Amino acid sequence: MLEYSELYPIQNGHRMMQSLDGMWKFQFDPEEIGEKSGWENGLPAPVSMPVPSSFADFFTDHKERDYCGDFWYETEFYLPAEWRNKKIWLRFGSITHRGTVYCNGMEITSHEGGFLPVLADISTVAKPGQVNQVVVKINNELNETSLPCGATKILNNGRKLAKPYFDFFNYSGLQRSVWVIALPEESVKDYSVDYELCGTDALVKYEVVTTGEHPVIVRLLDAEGELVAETEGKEGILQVANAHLWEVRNAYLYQIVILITDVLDEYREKIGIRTVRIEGTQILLNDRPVYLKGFGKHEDFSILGRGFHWGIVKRDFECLKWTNANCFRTSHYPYAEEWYQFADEEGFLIIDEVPAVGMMRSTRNFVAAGSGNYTYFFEALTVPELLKSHIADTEEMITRDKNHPSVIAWSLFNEPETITDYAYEYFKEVFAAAETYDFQSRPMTGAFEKNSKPELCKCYPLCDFICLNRYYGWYISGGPEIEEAEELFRDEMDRWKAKELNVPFVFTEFGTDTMAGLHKLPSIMWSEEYQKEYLEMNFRVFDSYEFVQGELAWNFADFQTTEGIMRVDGNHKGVFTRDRQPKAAAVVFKDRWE
Amino acid sequence: MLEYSELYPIQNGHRMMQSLDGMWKFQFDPEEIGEKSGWENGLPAPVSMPVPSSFADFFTDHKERDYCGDFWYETEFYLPAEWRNKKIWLRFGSITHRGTVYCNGMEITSHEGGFLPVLADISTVAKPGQVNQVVVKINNELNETSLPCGATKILNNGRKLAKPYFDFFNYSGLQRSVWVIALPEESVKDYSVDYELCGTDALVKYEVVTTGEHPVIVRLLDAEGELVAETEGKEGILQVANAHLWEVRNAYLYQIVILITDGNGVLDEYREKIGIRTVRIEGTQILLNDRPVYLKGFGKHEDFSILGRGFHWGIVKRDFECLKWTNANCFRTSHYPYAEEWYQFADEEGFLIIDEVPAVGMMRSTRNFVAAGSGNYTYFFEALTVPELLKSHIADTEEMITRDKNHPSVIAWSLFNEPETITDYAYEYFKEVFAAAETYDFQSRPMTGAFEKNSKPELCKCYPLCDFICLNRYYGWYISGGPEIEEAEELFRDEMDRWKAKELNVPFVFTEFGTDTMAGLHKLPSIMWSEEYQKEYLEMNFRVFDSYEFVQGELAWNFADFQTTEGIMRVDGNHKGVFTRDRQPKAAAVVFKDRWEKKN
Ligand SMILES: [Cl-]
Ligand SMILES: [Cl-]
Numbered sequence A: 001m002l003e004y005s006e007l008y009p010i011q012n013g014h015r016m017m018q019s020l021d022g023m024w025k026f027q028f029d030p031e032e033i034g035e036k037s038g039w040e041n042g043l044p045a046p047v048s049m050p051v052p053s054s055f056a057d058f059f060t061d062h063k064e065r066d067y068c069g070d071f072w073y074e075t076e077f078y079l080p081a082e083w084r085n086k087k088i089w090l091r092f093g094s095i096t097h098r099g100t101v102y103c104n105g106m107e108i109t110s111h112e113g114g115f116l117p118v119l120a121d122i123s124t125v126a127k128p129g130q131v132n133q134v135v136v137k138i139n140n141e142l143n144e145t146s147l148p149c150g151a152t153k154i155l156n157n158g159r160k161l162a163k164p165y166f167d168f169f170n171y172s173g174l175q176r177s178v179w180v181i182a183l184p185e186e187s188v189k190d191y192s193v194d195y196e197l198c199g200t201d202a203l204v205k206y207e208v209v210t211t212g213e214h215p216v217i218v219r220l221l222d223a224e225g226e227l228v229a230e231t232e233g234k235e236g237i238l239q240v241a242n243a244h245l246w247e248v249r250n251a252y253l254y255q256i257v258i259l260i261t262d263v264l265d266e267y268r269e270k271i272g273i274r275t276v277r278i279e280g281t282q283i284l285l286n287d288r289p290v291y292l293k294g295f296g297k298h299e300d301f302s303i304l305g306r307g308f309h310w311g312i313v314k315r316d317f318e319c320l321k322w323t324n325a326n327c328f329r330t331s332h333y334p335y336a337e338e339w340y341q342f343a344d345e346e347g348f349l350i351i352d353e354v355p356a357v358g359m360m361r362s363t364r365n366f367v368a369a370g371s372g373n374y375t376y377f378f379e380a381l382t383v384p385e386l387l388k389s390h391i392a393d394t395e396e397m398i399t400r401d402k403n404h405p406s407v408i409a410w411s412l413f414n415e416p417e418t419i420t421d422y423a424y425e426y427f428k429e430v431f432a433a434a435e436t437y438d439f440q441s442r443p444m445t446g447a448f449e450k451n452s453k454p455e456l457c458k459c460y461p462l463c464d465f466i467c468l469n470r471y472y473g474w475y476i477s478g479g480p481e482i483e484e485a486e487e488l489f490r491d492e493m494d495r496w497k498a499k500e501l502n503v504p505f506v507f508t509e510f511g512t513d514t515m516a517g518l519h520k521l522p523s524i525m526w527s528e529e530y531q532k533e534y535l536e537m538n539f540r541v542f543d544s545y546e547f548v549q550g551e552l553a554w555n556f557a558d559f560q561t562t563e564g565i566m567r568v569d570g571n572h573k574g575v576f577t578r579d580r581q582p583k584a585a586a587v588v589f590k591d592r593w594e
Numbered sequence B: 001m002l003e004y005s006e007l008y009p010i011q012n013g014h015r016m017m018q019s020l021d022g023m024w025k026f027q028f029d030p031e032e033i034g035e036k037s038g039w040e041n042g043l044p045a046p047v048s049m050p051v052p053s054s055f056a057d058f059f060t061d062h063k064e065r066d067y068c069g070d071f072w073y074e075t076e077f078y079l080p081a082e083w084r085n086k087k088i089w090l091r092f093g094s095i096t097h098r099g100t101v102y103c104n105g106m107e108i109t110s111h112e113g114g115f116l117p118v119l120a121d122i123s124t125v126a127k128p129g130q131v132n133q134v135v136v137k138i139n140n141e142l143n144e145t146s147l148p149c150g151a152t153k154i155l156n157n158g159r160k161l162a163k164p165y166f167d168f169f170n171y172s173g174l175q176r177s178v179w180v181i182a183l184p185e186e187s188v189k190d191y192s193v194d195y196e197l198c199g200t201d202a203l204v205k206y207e208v209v210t211t212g213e214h215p216v217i218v219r220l221l222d223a224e225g226e227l228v229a230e231t232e233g234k235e236g237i238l239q240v241a242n243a244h245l246w247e248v249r250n251a252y253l254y255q256i257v258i259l260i261t262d263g264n265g266v267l268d269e270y271r272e273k274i275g276i277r278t279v280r281i282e283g284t285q286i287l288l289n290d291r292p293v294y295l296k297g298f299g300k301h302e303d304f305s306i307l308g309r310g311f312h313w314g315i316v317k318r319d320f321e322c323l324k325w326t327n328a329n330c331f332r333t334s335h336y337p338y339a340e341e342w343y344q345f346a347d348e349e350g351f352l353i354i355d356e357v358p359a360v361g362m363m364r365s366t367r368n369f370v371a372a373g374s375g376n377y378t379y380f381f382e383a384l385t386v387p388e389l390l391k392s393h394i395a396d397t398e399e400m401i402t403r404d405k406n407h408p409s410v411i412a413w414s415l416f417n418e419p420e421t422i423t424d425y426a427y428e429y430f431k432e433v434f435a436a437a438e439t440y441d442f443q444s445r446p447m448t449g450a451f452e453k454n455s456k457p458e459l460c461k462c463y464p465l466c467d468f469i470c471l472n473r474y475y476g477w478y479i480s481g482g483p484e485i486e487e488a489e490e491l492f493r494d495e496m497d498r499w500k501a502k503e504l505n506v507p508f509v510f511t512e513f514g515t516d517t518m519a520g521l522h523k524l525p526s527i528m529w530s531e532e533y534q535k536e537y538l539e540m541n542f543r544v545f546d547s548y549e550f551v552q553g554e555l556a557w558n559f560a561d562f563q564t565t566e567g568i569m570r571v572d573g574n575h576k577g578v579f580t581r582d583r584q585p586k587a588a589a590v591v592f593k594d595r596w597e598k599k600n
Helices: A310-322 A337-346 A383-401 A421-437 A479-498 A528-542 A584-593 B313-326 B340-349 B386-404 B424-440 B482-501 B531-546 B588-597
Strands: A016-019 A022-029 A047-051 A070-078 A087-092 A098-103 A106-112 A118-121 A131-139 A150-154 A160-164 A178-183 A188-198 A201-210 A216-221 A227-232 A235-240 A254-260 A265-271 A276-279 A282-285 A292-296 A327-329 A349-353 A407-414 A444-448 A466-469 A505-509 A548-553 B016-019 B022-029 B047-051 B070-078 B087-092 B098-103 B106-112 B118-121 B131-139 B150-154 B160-164 B178-183 B188-198 B201-210 B216-221 B227-232 B235-240 B254-262 B265-274 B279-282 B285-288 B295-299 B330-332 B352-356 B410-417 B447-451 B469-472 B508-512 B551-557
Touching: A047 A070, A047 B313, A087 A098, A098 A118, A106 A118, A188 A254, A188 A265, A201 A216, A201 A254, A216 A235, A227 A235, A282 A548, A292 A505, A310 A337, A310 B022, A310 B047, A327 A548, A337 A349, A337 A383, A383 A407, A383 A421, A407 A421, A421 A444, A444 A505, A479 A528, A528 A548, A528 A584, B047 B070, B087 B098, B098 B118, B106 B118, B188 B254, B188 B265, B201 B216, B201 B254, B216 B235, B227 B235, B285 B551, B295 B313, B295 B508, B295 B588, B313 B340, B313 B588, B330 B551, B340 B352, B340 B386, B352 B386, B386 B410, B386 B424, B410 B424, B424 B447, B447 B508, B482 B531, B531 B551, B531 B588
Parallel strands: A292 A327, A292 A548, A327 A349, A349 A407, A407 A444, A444 A466, A466 A505, A505 A548, B295 B330, B295 B551, B330 B352, B352 B410, B410 B447, B447 B469, B469 B508, B508 B551
Antiparallel strands: A016 A178, A022 A047, A022 A070, A070 A131, A087 A118, A087 A178, A098 A106, A098 A131, A150 A160, A188 A201, A201 A235, A216 A227, A216 A254, A254 A265, A276 A282, B016 B178, B022 B047, B022 B070, B070 B131, B087 B118, B087 B178, B098 B106, B098 B131, B150 B160, B188 B201, B201 B235, B216 B227, B216 B254, B254 B265, B279 B285
């Protein structure tokens, strides 16, 4: 279990917080001489770099956009003098992909994983009342011992080029907000809630972790601040009579309030009373079935790359609502915590995905996810280091996101090898670990490439429901062969039906690249009309199987990828353009999903 | 003299700040009932709204995008206990266009002007160690008594529709960051610096304004932190030996430090970075640090996909990397003061700025870009609304100058863009604006504005007031375009020959010239709207500029495609950008890069 708290920062009497967002100093370190040359003390010749954002798309030259290797940030903040006697942490929403944090010259901690928060305890070096310095050494290379997976090519000048095993640009930097926070010396470290429904009434079971021994009181407030339940102890049950349940696209948020007393700490968070259970082939939310309708997405916008902005969230949610979606998948990595906060208010359902993408050794991975070629990926001697990373990223993800009502499943892989017992052994461990970290035991899943065929795949028995990525009519029998493609699709769904697994299937990826404004009569692959015809055919197949309980189309919006001959300025399978405007097919979803 | 400080917020022991950026609560008020119905105490049915951002582009239906009238924002912040016995202010970078601030139920203050900071003293109503509430009524209508000017149509169902007299979309709301801050009870309110060059040495003349009577000392620190000058007094001269001047695209910044002292103690401390440099017009020449400068760059807009005018540092970083690749040294803040961060960063990068008050649309026309050369006068400055418009024009000027005057990057004030000037009612109007501006600026730096074609040499009455003359011309586009471009050139030269013959002996800058250019539209031979036509229009206008000794700058229109109100002459905004709205370059962007690499 973890040496820090994953809880979002708040500001009350006992807990303080100050934003470090703004313009930082930035400098590339291509010869990797920073540590030995005093950069922990300040950067020798930096530039200005916005935070949060991704560094790549600001520059005007290739070597800098495509930089791969070591690079540094530095900034300076004044701590209020009133934060003596408090524990003081730096909280980075993310450090992509790995980094060591230095503060006032001292190395505080290093982290691996570029999509989950990083906590640095600077209590012993922070100078309250004075100006303080923070310096972060970051690395954005890809390998097969960390997620997401890939490789690093050295070119003739010795400069490094990222060669990912995934299909999305390797944005990196400090992409999410950065805080400095003050906690009490005895503090709430973690807590977990589970829900039971008793007719109209409800139980909120909870457990609490603290950095101390003092008694804990837990209060639960309704939307208007009035009290509805109170229990003493670090373990308890809250009784909410005539409970107001969090519903799909109709949220109700209670407020939990955790206290440590003699009052030493207070933590407050919005939660939603709802239950998630798989009965047979159905997904039950509050004991009634739900059908998932929505999109795979990316944290991706012009200029900012993966940088968080609230304006992107607002628009992306006003578009999801306009299509009448109810659900999205945080593909292929946990998002910024603000996305889940807002999903909670709006009643969207989230499949939360750990970044286990790239577990097949292929640099053009999307044509290759149906080629039939096994890459011997889980037979290699780096696999134990990889497994340790994957489990640690699952643990940090679940701890961070488990108390959001919108999060209803965990996706623990996208398009890996599953056709050999080497991969069963691997994934069995991962699921085992995820089952222990989630106090609610909500459904665990992953998304399968076409190569994980019903006859050969070893891993679908680990899944509570099964997610399929399928491109019938695009990478398989596309264009004039599109009727062959429908058959082949039905052929496979027939074989899955024949297995009588009695579990739900969700299509988590299907789509066509579509250039906005390419019209052709008759339609051709890449036009707007072909996208509509494609979707109308996948819909017919989905609607032919009682156990298909969900469609998450790929993608919500055009996004940026590694450049290559099959990628025309990124990936054009969006239903919206990258500036968040709808292609002709968005209307297809809107109508179907009403 | 203003009842508050325009000084950007800092965080030291004496001064603390807290950001309120985030999701605020938002609610439209089409019936205009919020105050009588208690919205000052919280909104009844809100939705969430990013701050900073313009609200318009988030929504999916026209009624909300095109909303005009009253609308309300609300949030809640915790004030640390330790801020008892401090003066506590809310500081909005901007409230667009007018608004009334409420804090814990109480009307604190009102403000008119959508593009400069709003300061609201909440010291008597703030509750430290408790959670506090802010609520703002905003109105984004346009009128003829405030800037920028327009009108307001009432549709048949009672809906208000904005009808601006300007060519940009009427984005509005809380478009810039918002802070709550704590100041000392005796604080630095204001300061001003002027400079004189003394060979290897330099003088920094200054003056400080405080809110009490304890004494001031002023320190000056070089770039590396070391003390290079010190002076007691609220008015002084700092003596910098072996000064590092601030130079175009080669910036050096000192830190100035202003203390209010209680003998051996410190009451207040303010620090800003500044840059020693001098600006002077000598004849037809624009002298920076005693050498001539040719202005090369762009008129810009605070504009970006989804965010509207919302401020983001990444828009800044990208926009400056593009300006550097272009080899520009200049830009004008058309047509309103920008977020302060823009100027802070121009100081680090050494760009020259022309700072523009929002005095645009002073001529009644709703399709006003076909009408800046039409020849039709609209009696704009004889209306009885004009004395009110003058007062808020001066008020915005004083507020812009007080805010921006200490940036090295700011070399001149633009006080109008394309107004009617062919009339003595207009001379009498602008004599007052300029007289006002002269007083608020401690550096008496150059004042100008930008003239439409309508303001001909023989008819214009306002160019005498200008230390240099900015022209917006579109010969080869709105006038005599496409096949007739040969004629557009002779017409252009004929106008310039008349300016020449006046022998005014002042510098002329071209602040607008451009062609709508659709990215990707290629024609051989070229046609108006093709990328090829943009390049040729430009090569033509450069030949004209270069024929006149007194032309000393060229700011092309626009850096980037930007959003306007819609209509038949506007294909999803304005397409005179040299870059796209997503900040990639059309073919005429290298025309600039090459010309400007090889100028000075
Ligand atoms: Cl290059
Ligand atoms: Cl509509």
